[PDB]
C-alpha cells in the first residue's frame, strides 16, 4: 500500500551460451545504463571480492558457479571504494546532472528509495538489499547452469485476482490524493469548509458506472469492462 | 470453482515477530559459509533471514494457522530440496479448502 512504485528490477546475464566474457549487469530505476553487479555491491558497501561472492554463491565447493562470476569481478575491478561506485552509478543519468557532489548524492537516493523498494525504502538496509541481489544472481546462475527450469509465467500460484475491494482501493487512493491537492490549492488561495466532496462521489460513480477504472471523463489509457451490468436472465446466470 | 476463495490480505508483522522468536537469524547477521545449509525465510518476497531447524519451525507455524493463531488465509510452503520457506500474507491469492 502507499504510492505503489511500479519499479521492476532486471538482472541480465550478457553474452550467449558459447560467447567468451559472460558478464552480469543490472538495470536500475531512474538509471540509463546496466550496472555490473559488483559496482552495485560496492555502492551498497560490500567492497572486497569474495565478500561480494559470499552474497551470491553460498557454497565454496561450487567452482562451476564461481568461475561464472570471474568475468563480473574483472568487469567491476575498475571501481574500488563505495564513493567511486556511487559516482559511477550517478554518472549514468538522470540525463547526467553534471556536478561531482550531485551524482554521488543522487545515486544514494535511488538505492535507498527506488532499487528493491519492498524490504525497505528506509536508510541503513544495505545488508538486506545486497543479500537479496545476491539471492537473485544465485537464481539467475542456477537456471543458466541447468540446475533449475526457467519460471512458468502461467503458474496460478504466481497470479493474483484484484477483486471488488482492491479495485475500489486503487480508485479511492487516486481520488483522495486529487482531493488532497485541491485542499492545498484552497489553503494557498487563503492568504488570510470549501472542500469539493463532489470529486470523491462523482469519481467513484463515474468509474463504477462506465467501467473506465481511471481519472476521469478523459479515459484512455484507463482500463475498461471492469464494471458491467449484472446478468438477470436466469438465477445461475 | 464453487469452493474457491480469494485471499483478502493480512498483516505480515505478527508473523515476522513470531518467526524471529522461533529461531530466525536476521539477514543483517547472516554469514553464508558459517551456516551454509540454512533454510532461507521469505515473507511476501522479502528475505528476512535464515533458520537452522526448519522442520520444527514449519510444524510450529502450521499448528499456529491450524489452531487459528495465524489467519487460515495465509500461505506457507517449505521447498526442502531448494532449502526455502516462503510465507504469504498477500491479497489476491486463490485458495480452496481441503
Amino acid at each position: 500500500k502507499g504510492s505503489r512504485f511500479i519499479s521492476t528490477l532486471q538482472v541480465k546475464l550478457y553474452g550467449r551460451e558459447g560467447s567468451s566474457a559472460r558478464t552480469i549487469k543490472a538495470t536500475l530505476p531512474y538509471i540509463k545504463q546496466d550496472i555490473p553487479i559488483v559496482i552495485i555491491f560496492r555502492a551498497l558497501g560490500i567492497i572486497p571480492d569474495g565478500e561480494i561472492l559470499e552474497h551470491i554463491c553460498y557454497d565454496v565447493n561450487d567452482w562451476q558457479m564461481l568461475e561464472m562470476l570471474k568475468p563480473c569481478v574483472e568487469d567491476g575491478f575498475v571501481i574500488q571504494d563505495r564513493e567511486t561506485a556511487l559516482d559511477f552509478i550517478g554518472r549514468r543519468g538522470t540525463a547526467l546532472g553534471i556536478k561531482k557532489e550531485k551524482r554521488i548524492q543522487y545515486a544514494k537516493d535511488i538505492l535507498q528509495k527506488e532499487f528493491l523498494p519492498h524490504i525497505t525504502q528506509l536508510e541503513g538496509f544495505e545488508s538486506r538489499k545486497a543479500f537479496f541481489l545476491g539471492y537473485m544472481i544465485n537464481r539467475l546462475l542456477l537456471c543458466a547452469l541447468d540446475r533449475k527450469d526457467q519460471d512458468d509465467r502461467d503458474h496460478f500460484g504466481k497470479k493474483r485476482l484484484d477483486l471488488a475491494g482492491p479495485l475500489l482501493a486503487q480508485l479511492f487512493k487516486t481520488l483522495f490524493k486529487k482531493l488532497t491537492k485541491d485542499i492545498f490549492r484552497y489553503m494557498q488561495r487563503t492568504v488570510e469548509l470549501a472542500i469539493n466532496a463532489k470529486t470523491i462521489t462523482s469519481g467513484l460513480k463515474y468509474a463504477l458506472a462506465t467501467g473506465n477504472w481511471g481519472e476521469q471523463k478523459k479515459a484512455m489509457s484507463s482500463r475498461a469492462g471492469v464494471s458491467q451490468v449484472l446478468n438477470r436472465y436466469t438465477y445461475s446466470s | 470453482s464453487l469452493m474457491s476463495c480469494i485471499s483478502v490480505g493480512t498483516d505480515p508483522m505478527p508473523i515476522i515477530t513470531f518467526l524471529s522468536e522461533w529461531g530466525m537469524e536476521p539477514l543483517e547477521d547472516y554469514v553464508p559459509h558459517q551456516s551454509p545449509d540454512a533454510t532461507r525465510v521469505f515473507v511476501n518476497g522479502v528475505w528476512h533471514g535464515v533458520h537452522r531447524n526448519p522442520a520444527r519451525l514449519m510444524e510450529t507455524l502450521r499448528t499456529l494457522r491450524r489452531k487459528g493463531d495465524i489467519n487460515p488465509e495465509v500461505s506457507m510452503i517449505r521447498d526442502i530440496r531448494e532449502k526455502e520457506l516462503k510465507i504469504f500474507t498477500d491479497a489476491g491469492r486463490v485458495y480452496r479448502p481441503l
Partner: peptide, 30 residues
Amino acid sequence: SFNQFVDYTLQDIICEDSTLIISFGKIYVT
C-alpha cells in the same frame, strides 16, 4: 473483499500521505 476494504483499507488510505502544512483522523461510514 469489500468488507476488508471498508473497515480496514479505507482507514489506511485516509492517513498515509494525508497530513498537510491539517491532518486526517478516524473515518466514519454512515
